[PDB]
Design a binder for this molecule. Structure first.
Ligand code: HEM
Ligand code: HEM
Ligand code: HEM
Ligand code: HEM
Lengths: 142, 141, 141, 142
């Protein structure tokens, strides 16, 4: 799927991602840009405005776990459907997350990386990350 | 459907793009061709290599059209009726491809205008591009 | 965006539905609950058994709303603003579910009104329901 | 996936489908209701109006082959991803049919069955066919 040069590109940039912040910024933007996804996080408290969403502690703590799982995916790019098997169960059996939403989060994460890295998120680097987030979206769909 | 706040957001953001709209249009096309290579099938007679002057000129046309869509955001079906004739009647572009170029434009604006691309603006821009996309893919004239 | 021909088609077809719109609304809900059981998660306090009087009454409300959407097909954002507040702000219905109920309504009209459901009408009805769906899932007020 | 009672329902109704007509009516409606799909059939001639589309001989002959393949699917409901493997290659390698379109044709076929069978296409029968056309759409996506 990925070329050896694509894998090196994806890896190098991921070494520079703040893993305390990026996950939250992505989950945060998902809730603001596609507001029906707020239904799945009713227990997280106040999600009433963008400023509320982006400052919610529980959104930040949960984005850290989401980004943790993307990291585990980048370490097992060849075996994504195995790395994410328990996680597909959870999103389908307990919640029923329509699989279109997994594709939306992947694309919000690419925007947040663009936002953080600027001119360093070149078209070739973006094209490598689009392959990884499509990978992850497909292994979550149950 | 855009809220009144969505419209203020889009006008302010696109205004900041300014005289860079051409270069942003071209970069978004290059991102879409590289990340989603099936889209190249709509441009068979184009040179689509990196730094192509045809892509540069097309990116400028796409940007000028979005500027005009922004200035007529209340009356978009009427301001974009010729583009709609071209995309829905003549080219028959599959609507999935509009989601792809919309994403590549958001990525381009996020990489170049980071201070403007807040979550509120991101949400407005995304709704604007979906509405432009719906007018381009509909036969209504 | 609806063409003028699309609007004539929808008005004529829905007109034929007539005083059966309630029973058609109820049948479409029953088809959606049986074919796509995740949709039941939006109605936890309902009795959703076959022949339920709650589904029958809800199907009537859904049909009356579509009748009204048809009568204000040029000004739908304004005629459906309270339903939009309910579906987009309060219930947060995922937009995928609107495609499901739209399909179940087309199936119901095809099974009951076969002579009216030509390919041209099918195409108009499908565009109408997508446009109603877009107003219900957007926060614009 | 299907219950033994669902399989019997699906089979019984399919025994009454006109296999010379239904395939064309479905392909025909796909081109009229979702007009961008006309791009994939430029060689078929006049597709300019609904009356033109529904009367095109080449649309009718091609709908027969599409319905033939749905029939082969209903005979191998347990092994759909094998029955359709060559066919997934063709729609992806030679054409590039976006897989959302496979889901649209399946739903147009359910409407045409509704249209032909009327009150006999009950909600339980429809729910069995939705499982079969989702099955087929997924085995075509490449
Ligand atoms: C696309 C990549 C995604 C990944 C990698 C991901 C990953 C995760 C992880 C790691 C957890 C926590 C698992 C645990 O602690 O046991 C989780 C939980 C959850 N995810 Fe996702 N997720 C994704 C997409 C989504 C989407 C699109 C939604 C909703 C629209 C969603 C809604 C949830 C919810 C509701 C929980 C449970 C949270 C809670 O109970 O507090 N996820 N996901
Ligand atoms: C916001 C979305 C879009 C905008 C504003 C847009 C705008 C334009 C404009 C202004 C033109 C040239 C019009 C002219 O010179 O007469 C054009 C042509 C064209 N567009 Fe689009 N477009 C969009 C999306 C797309 C997408 C998604 C595709 C395909 C993936 C596409 C394919 C084409 C093609 C093939 C041409 C013709 C190029 C040529 O023949 O020279 N467009 N578009
Ligand atoms: C054309 C599409 C739709 C129309 C016209 C429609 C119309 C309506 C109407 C008229 C009401 C009742 C309003 C009231 O009494 O205040 C309603 C309520 C509701 N709708 Fe929809 N609806 C549609 C689609 C959907 C879909 C797709 C879902 C979920 C799958 C949904 C879930 C609900 C729920 C949960 C209620 C509240 C029921 C209750 O609390 O009693 N609707 N809808
Ligand atoms: C969803 C179920 C579908 C099935 C079962 C199906 C089946 C078939 C079959 C059996 C063939 C002919 C194979 C052969 O003769 O070697 C074929 C060809 C083709 N299909 Fe499909 N198809 C489906 C969906 C679609 C869709 C959605 C499109 C386009 C939107 C499409 C476009 C084509 C085209 C262009 C050909 C080649 C026709 C030609 O060259 O004349 N198909 N398909």
């Amino acid at each position: 799927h990925l070329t050896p040069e694509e894998k090196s590109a994806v890896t190098a940039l991921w070494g520079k991602v703040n893993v305390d912040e990026v996950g939250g910024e992505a989950l945060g933007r998902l809730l603001v840009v596609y507001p029906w996804t707020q239904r799945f996080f009713e227990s997280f408290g106040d999600l009433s405005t963008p400023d509320a969403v982006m400052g919610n502690p529980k959104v930040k703590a949960h984005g850290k776990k989401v980004l943790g799982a993307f990291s585990d995916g980048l370490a097992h790019l060849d075996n994504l459907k195995g790395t994410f098997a328990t996680l597909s169960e959870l999103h389908c059996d307990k919640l029923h997350v329509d699989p279109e939403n997994f594709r939306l989060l992947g694309n919000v994460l690419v925007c947040v990386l663009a936002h953080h890295f600027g001119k360093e998120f070149t078209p070739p680097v973006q094209a490598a990350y689009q392959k990884v987030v499509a990978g992850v979206a497909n292994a979550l769909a149950h | 459907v855009l809220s009144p706040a969505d419209k203020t957001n889009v006008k302010a953001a696109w205004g900041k793009v300014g005289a860079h709209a051409g270069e942003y249009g071209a970069e978004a096309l290059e991102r879409m061709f590289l990340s989603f290579p099936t889209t190249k099938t709509y441009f068979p007679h184009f040179d689509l290599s990196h730094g192509s002057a045809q892509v540069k000129g097309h990116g400028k046309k796409v940007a000028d059209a979005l500027t005009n869509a922004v200035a007529h955001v209340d009356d978009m079906p009427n301001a974009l009726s010729a583009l709609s004739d071209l995309h829905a009647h003549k080219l028959r572009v599959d609507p999935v491809n509009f989601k792809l170029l919309s994403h590549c434009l958001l990525v381009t604006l996020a990489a170049h205008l980071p201070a403007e691309f807040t979550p509120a603006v991101h949400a407005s821009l995304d709704k604007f591009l979906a509405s432009v996309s719906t007018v381009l893919t509909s036969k209504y004239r």
